[PDB]
């Protein structure tokens, strides 16, 4: 399972960056356009950026908490790749490296960051809590998965609602779904990750001892773009201007002064897209309630 | 159960479509492709039935024949060890 590209094609794109061109039609520092569409279920969404397609799912159920944090509920994200999304991939390799490179990000992007209040999953302390689940599916790759799965999970959390609960010791009263309403969830902050994609037009030494910074960085590598890149970097931020994570794990060497200059441009990008989610969550729920207005008057 | 269809070429003297049950014997398990598996409780009851038809056709009658052969093989075993 190996992608084969000519070195002639390798120089071609490398030339295009040397004349400030890229094959998609975007700018270097331009991001794709995002299509968000929800299914009928809560925590159901289809997210699409041109060629890359994803789908995720949020659910929850009853379990006991750990001994470790006996206060808090349970939550984890599955991101199992299927070779449906591209023939590179093993059947569910949880031990591949790029998978881990997809994993630990979303592990830190959600779980260690804590966008979601796990303490608001405590139904009863130590007895019964929530087990909230996030199964990420990939559909078709043009890269940006780890940015797409960044979004589509956080999209899904802002669309899921959990049903109604009443406690009497052991008499724990999960109510019918349609009499007593499902209840949405508590998001502390909304993180958005950004892939950065790196291209030395030169050898090693002109990056190493060539003092002249000459390295091109772009956003959202397409599939062919992604196969030649030299370093890998993802930052994540919010609306309140705090930096969630940064991960440059090796690759090409890279100036620090670039990275701050990189990460500022992230901010203006992610903010506009964030609010686009925020209206569509409202507007769909508005469309839910206008169709709820088109239901009770109908019924 | 297994249903096969037959070659004219393969004969040795000492269409044609044969039902076999009690399947075993790798050569059989390789080469039988339309097959029937049945659960049944002895008073004519049926917990499940399982058809994978990948070789022959299936008649309505090999069905009934296997059904006739179902209620025998089960009911004996109900009565065989009387537990």
């Amino acid at each position: 399972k190996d992608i084969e590209i000519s070195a002639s094609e390798s120089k071609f794109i490398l030339e295009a960056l040397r004349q400030n061109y890229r094959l998609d039609g975007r700018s270097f520092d331009q991001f794709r356009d995002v299509e968000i569409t929800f299914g009928k279920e809560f925590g159901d969404v289809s997210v699409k950026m041109g060629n890359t397609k994803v789908h995720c799912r949020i659910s929850c159920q009853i379990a006991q908490p750990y001994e470790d944090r006996p206060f808090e509920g349970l939550f984890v994200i599955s991101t199992e790749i299927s070779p449906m999304a591209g023939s590179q991939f093993e059947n569910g390799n949880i031990t591949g490296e790029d998978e881990v490179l997809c994993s630990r990000i979303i592990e830190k992007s959600v779980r260690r960051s804590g966008a979601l209040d796990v303490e608001g999953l405590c139904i009863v302390a130590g007895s019964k809590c929530w087990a909230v689940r996030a199964d990420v599916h990939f559909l078709d790759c043009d890269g940006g998965f780890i940015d797409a799965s960044c979004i589509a999970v956080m999209a899904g959390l802002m669309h899921f609602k959990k049903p109604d609960i009443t406690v009497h010791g052991e008499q724990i009263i999960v109510h019918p779904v349609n009499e007593r309403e499902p209840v949405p969830l508590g998001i502390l902050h909304i993180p958005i990750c950004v892939t950065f994609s790196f291209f030395n037009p030169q050898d090693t030494e002109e990056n190493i001892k060539g003092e002249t910074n000459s390295e091109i960085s772009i956003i959202d590598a397409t599939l062919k773009e992604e196969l030649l890149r030299d370093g890998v970097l993802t930052v994540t931020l919010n609306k309140n201007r705090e930096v969630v994570q940064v991960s440059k794990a090796g690759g090409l060497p890279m100036d620090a002064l670039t990275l701050m200059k990189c990460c500022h441009e992230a901010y203006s990008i992610i903010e506009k897209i964030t609010d686009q989610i925020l209206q569509l969550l409202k507007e769909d729920s508005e469309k839910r309630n206008k169709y709820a207005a088109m239901l009770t008057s109908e019924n | 159960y297994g249903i096969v269809e037959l070659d004219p070429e393969c004969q040795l003297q000492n269409l044609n479509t044969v039902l076999i049950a009690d399947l075993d014997t790798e050569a059989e398990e390789t080469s039988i492709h339309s097959t029937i598996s049945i659960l049944a409780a002895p008073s004519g009851n049926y917990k499940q039935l399982t058809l994978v038809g990948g070789g022959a056709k299936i008649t309505p009658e090999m069905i009934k024949r296997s059904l006739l052969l179902s209620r025998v093989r089960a009911d004996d075993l109900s009565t065989r060890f009387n537990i």
Binding site: E170, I172 | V4, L6, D7, C10, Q11, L12, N14, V18, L19, I20, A21, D22, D24, T25, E26, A27, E28, T30, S31, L69, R73, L77, R80, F81, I83
Partner: protein, 120 residues
């Protein structure tokens, strides 16, 4: 050209290893099975129940055993042994929601070492 092409024939144990299929077709010519059976000749079934449960001896049930009701099965050339344990969770007409089952684990000792096979 009408030709008496003489074929090459073998012992039957040669043939099945070579052709599972044609050696079967030999048996179908006589109308038999390569397990030496006729069409509807069915294997014998032999059991012993309750031998490996601790509740075998109603008189003296022993101490450290943990098995509820056991079954031996041999039929043909395959011996299969069924063992029942049970566990308890603290619990807090003919429709499916009334209905539960057990949790079984099969192993087929088919010579292959390794993980859980997909047949199992």
């Amino acid at each position: 050209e009408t030709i008496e092409i003489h074929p090459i024939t073998f012992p039957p144990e040669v043939l099945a290893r070579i052709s599972p299929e044609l050696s079967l077709q030999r048996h179908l010519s006589l109308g038999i099975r390569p397990c030496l059976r006729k069409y509807e000749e069915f294997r014998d079934v032999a059991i012993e129940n309750n031998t490996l449960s601790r509740y075998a001896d109603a008189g003296n049930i022993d101490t450290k055993n943990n098995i509820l009701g056991s079954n031996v099965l041999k039929s043909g050339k395959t011996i299969v042994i069924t063992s029942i344990t049970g566990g308890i969770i603290e619990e807090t007409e003919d429709i499916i929601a009334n209905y539960a089952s057990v949790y079984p684990v099969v192993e087929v000792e088919r010579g292959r070492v390794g993980a859980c096979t997909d047949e199992e």
